Amino acid sequence: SAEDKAAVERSKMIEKQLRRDKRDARRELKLLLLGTGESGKSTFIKQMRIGIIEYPFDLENIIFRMVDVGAQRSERRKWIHCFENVTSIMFLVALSEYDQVLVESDNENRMEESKALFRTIITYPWFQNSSVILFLNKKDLLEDKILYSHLVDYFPEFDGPQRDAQAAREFILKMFVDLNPDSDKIIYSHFTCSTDTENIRFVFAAVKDTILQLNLKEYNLV
Amino acid sequence: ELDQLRQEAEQLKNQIRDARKACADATLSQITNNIDPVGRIQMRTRRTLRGHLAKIYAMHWGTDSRLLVSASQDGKLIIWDSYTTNKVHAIPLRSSWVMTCAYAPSGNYVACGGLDNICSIYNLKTREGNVRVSRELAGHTGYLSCCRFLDDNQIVTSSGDTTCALWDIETGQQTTTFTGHTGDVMSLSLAPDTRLFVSGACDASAKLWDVREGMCRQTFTGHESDINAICFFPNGNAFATGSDDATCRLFDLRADQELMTYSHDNIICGITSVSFSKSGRLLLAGYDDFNCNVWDALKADRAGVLAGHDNRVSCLGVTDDGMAVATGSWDSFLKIWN
Amino acid sequence: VQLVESGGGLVQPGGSRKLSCSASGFAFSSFGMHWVRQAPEKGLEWVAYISSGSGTIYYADTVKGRFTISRDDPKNTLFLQMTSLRSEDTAMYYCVRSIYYYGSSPFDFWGQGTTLTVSSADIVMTQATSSVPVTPGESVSISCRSSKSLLHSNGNTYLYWFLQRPGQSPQLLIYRMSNLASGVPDRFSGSGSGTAFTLTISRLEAEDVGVYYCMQHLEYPLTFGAGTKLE
Amino acid sequence: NPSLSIDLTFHLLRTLLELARTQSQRERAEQNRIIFDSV
Amino acid sequence: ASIAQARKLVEQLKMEANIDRIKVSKAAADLMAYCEAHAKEDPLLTPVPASENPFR
Amino acid sequence: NTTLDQIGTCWPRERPCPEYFNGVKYNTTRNAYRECLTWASKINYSQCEPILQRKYDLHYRIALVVNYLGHCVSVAALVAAFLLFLALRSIRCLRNVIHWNLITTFILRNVMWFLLQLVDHEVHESNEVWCRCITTIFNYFVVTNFFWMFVEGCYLHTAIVMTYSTERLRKCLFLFIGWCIPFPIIVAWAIGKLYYENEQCWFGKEPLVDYIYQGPIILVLLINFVFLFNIVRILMTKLRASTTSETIQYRKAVKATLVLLPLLGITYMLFFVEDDLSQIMFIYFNSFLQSFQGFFVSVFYCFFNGEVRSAVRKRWHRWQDHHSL
């Protein structure tokens, strides 16, 4: 009928808009940012600029969409599965939290909770098709705190000078990298701070390398 | 005081268990031996709806059995014409991370929401002709897991902040809260008379809530793992639930205990969606096995399988007259079976 | 939600005019648009349709080859280029918006109108009675006939009813004889078979004075009834 | 006479046709020898 | 807060314990009777011919 | 009396041998003689000797058998892969569309190869319509396959060099490139061949028309070689970043190069263009590479493809669960 044909034409118009949005979705790349409030993630976002929170930003021609879910008070196990299509998972953690403890005020470090979250997220089967990015924040505050408070109280496996901030960075990095049981995946690590404006190029390079590794695996070249 | 309250609670739970055993003269399977089975199920695909760009998460049939609403990751809340596979609406979302959706029984409104913690209600019947935001019901700290309409004025939602809520649509504020669960609440199913509903949560126990009174009527601690989806039985005295432990559990409200366990040796995957047929004789359940199983709800036998999807099954529904079965998966296709 | 029309006036035969229709307050680009004409001594006569996105265009048999319908979505303006104007083309012109889908309410807004003065197989809609004197509070039964059956295999019968009040643009009353238009009170109803139609009015109000139209939407071109006035 | 790897199919076809023509001409020559010896 | 929560749980168990419960086999027979009575109204259990099915 | 002989020559009461008899050429330098008793019935044909530089026939028959076995098993694998691509409706991405069109072109040129086997010397000599049509269609599928390997080279190079441009590309461009472009090229080839060299069936060669179609193909191979270089360069960078061991780097780069070789057509550049032993090993090796190219591409990019294997497994589980109940 005339109404049936007009409805089909309107459906085709909708399909045209869906194709346009498909092209835009292809251009858009999703990025997941994980971390807690005390890590200083608002300063990181402020550097990157120049419920679930969307942070779109542009490159020269590449569009990135950073996703912040850290405001939500929930159990990750029953919603995190929707992030399978994210190219890389970013973990923003501060290096100065070794003197800090959880809200329960017991003998558990916030870095231990960070490691537990690190391994819990990596062991999810939906995220075993993507890469991991590790942002280590407050390196200058780490440099000040390691002189204020010696690197002895939470670190029984540390071998090095107790005031060597570079050894602290390398040791914490090593402990984080050793938590990944799957040799197929690589962790892209960066040392950042409140004044580091190069974080966007680290993200660009890490995402590019993630895409290239996914292509090389898909091409059966490795 | 805490230890004596815990001892009293344990004694009350033991009294409830003793009453449940006292009234358990028989199970369902011991009286269905004298009724004929449903036999072979030969349902086929009638329509395929191809209009989604990313993972589909939820759908809801309309009461006229003709229109359906579906939600997907790409930010389009798409309303489909079931007979001619026409696209009726493609509503852009402010937040594409949508987990649930609902269709009002009048056809005037739809609801949606997800990780934004906001229940968004859209008006389908406007002077301007376009679909715009009518209400933003922001009142939760966890993800919005399920919404269902009672009418155009009241909507029942359940979210991930352990609270269920009855929302007043016209005011924009909550009518009442249901602070009974200890874990994230995943789904709700409404009774046909709008007086009661059943919610389930990560604490492996279903709760019957009274919409108007504001109290929980029944607690069913019968599960081993997280409850994912609920569908209410049409006669108002029973319901069925699904969970990660691969057993689909048929509960009876008046019996105040379980009627029947559904399990099979070659099923190890959890349940993501459930629905009833019109008569309640056939129970439909979606699994991580990439198919939808047809179970004979009275004989307990396996009746059939509908396997027309490639990725994980996320949503399942049946028309109010039972005319058609609709399935949706993360492969961005919808399927209609009959 | 406004439609402001221009491009009319008094012209000479053989000339040409460009009509404009300025749309405001609604999502114009998603709508299909109609031009409708009405002679002073006649009822409404449908002229042309353009779909949303200009995917398809339809013309009446007496319109095709002479008039051109066009639209500009980013400025939300409808255009009509009319050449070879005849004395028979003197009429009040209407800019109409519509959406076509299951459950939609097309023709729910009619424009202000503009005056233009110039110095076979189609379905015929018959309304034999020119007017009925009425009294407020009484019921009214107004019949309409179609030359063809309007019952399609999908079960729907594509009849619409309209009210044109004196000095006012036509207002939609009923579509598909079951679904009452928004803003219209529940005292209006319709019924009938595939060919024999009835409009039933209970508890008549003073504001119900005007001309009643029945219309078929089975196939293009669209045709209108003669019109029944309530006096 | 250059031979390219992208025309090997037709090069082999031409060579096999030349060989078949050579064998056919040899057989016909022997038959003509028989005919002439008879005549 | 845990004391108040224990109080709420105790009162909820009191409210849920003091209810009238029906014989299980009787309710099961009522569900069976419901399934039987509406069997002819169920187009998934009962096949629908092409002249009635809008999908055929 | 004087009469004509079997050829039509009038004898006296000494003549040259005929030029041709049943298609065989003769050396007409020598004369035949007529015996006399009045003429005798015997004609002296002892002077009319028929006249008949060769290559090794056995090695060409071996190459033909090798081509038969390679193309037959390639046909089997391509049919299997084609059916797998049609049965598994989850395989939709642009990469797999390009690979499916590559499979289609391999099976079409193999079918044409089979169709062109029943040709004798008479079909060669007589420029019949069906022969030149088969030749033109075969050359069309060959240049079409080369253009689809150009498409694969461009897509692969983009995917490894330009991550933005990987997503910028659409199937609406590659379907155009892989179908519309070879048609006027093969039409211009057919027109030039009909105009210039129409004495023999068009698969023949004379000591310029073929450069119309052979010209860009070599250029395609050359640019794909350049593409391959950049890919290996990036691969080496990845090998520097991933494994940090020269043994693993070289093992992975060699395996990647060896598997990329039949996909991009670079095998034809490995052995490019007097010495009979070197020429026969040239023909043997290029016959091997050509006959197994479709087999190797189909097997590696379908039977060893993770996504394809998973889709096959899921389909098998669906079948087993459906039919078991």
Residue numbers in the entry:
A (entry chain A): 12 to 61, 188 to 359
B (entry chain B): 3 to 340
C (entry chain H): 2 to 120, 135 to 246
D (entry chain U): 2 to 40
E (entry chain G): 7 to 62
F (entry chain P): 41 to 53, 61 to 84, 88 to 102, 106 to 260, 263 to 328, 332 to 383
Mind quoting what the paper says about this structure?
Corticotropin releasing factor (CRF) and three urocortin peptides (UCN1, UCN2, UCN3) are crucial stress hormones that can differentially bind to and activate CRF receptors type 1 (CRF1R) and type 2 (CRF2R), which are members of the class B GPCRs. Both CRF1R and CRF2R are thought to mediate diverse signaling pathways through their interactions with several heterotrimeric (αβγ) G protein subtypes, including different Gα subunits, such as Gαs, Gαi, Gαo, Gαq, and Gα118,9,14–17. CRF1R and CRF2R primarily activate cAMP-PKA pathways via Gs coupling, which mediate stress responses and have been implicated in the pathophysiology of various diseases.
The Rosetta refinement improved the atomic details in the CRF2R-G11 complex structure that was built in a 3.7 Å cryo-EM map, with chemically optimized side chain rotamers and the global protein geometry. We truncated many side chains in the Rosetta-refined model of the CRF2R-G11 complex to obtain the final model for Protein Data Bank deposition, to reflect the quality of the electron density map. ICL2 in the CRF2R-G11 and CRF2R-Gs structures adopts a short helix that forms extensive interactions with G11 and Gs. In the G11–bound structure, T216ICL2, Y217ICL2, E220ICL2, R2234.41b formed an interface with the αN helix, the β2-β3 loop and the α5 helix of G11. Y217ICL2 formed hydrogen bonds with N198, mutation Y217ICL2A also abolished coupling of G11. In addition, E355 and N357 of G11-α5, forms an electrostatic interaction with R1482.46b and a hydrogen bond contact with F3627.60b, respectively, all are important for stabilizing the interface of α5 of G11 with TM2, TM3, TM5, TM6 and TM7 of the receptor.
